């Protein structure tokens, strides 16, 4: 899922580099909110057919992560695994192998 500690420029550039379709979603570190992160998904308006959206996330008080109150987890891997089946609160589900 995540490639490392990239998500603003690096991610937005690699997300549109090879032409990886929807589902290529990665996790990174927030530059404005440490301890939390922002989902970098290749989501568009369907007119451009090429764009990246940043979903600002918040860390759980009990020590976890959740994009929505309808699906909260404790680890990133567990979160990814659940969104890898379907969309629990995003524009698209996390269905992608790798793109290194």
């Amino acid at each position: 899922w995540y490639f490392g500690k990239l998500g603003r420029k690096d991610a937005e550039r690699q997300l549109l580099s090879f032409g990886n379709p929807r589902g290529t979603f990665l996790i990174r570190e927030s530059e404005t909110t440490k301890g939390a992160y922002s989902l970098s998904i290749r989501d568009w308006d369907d007119m451009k057919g090429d764009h990246v959206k940043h979903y600002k996330i918040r860390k759980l008080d009990n020590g976890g992560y959740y994009i929505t109150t309808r699906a909260q987890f404790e680890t990133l891997q567990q979160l990814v695994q659940h969104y890898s089946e379907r969309a629990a609160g995003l524009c698209c589900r996390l269905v992608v192998p790798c793109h290194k």
Binding site: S38, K53, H54, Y55, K56, I67, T68, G89, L90, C91
Partner: peptide
Amino acid sequence: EPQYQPGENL
């Protein structure tokens, strides 16, 4: 302000 745009499916 950062470009934060959360899109849920509620």
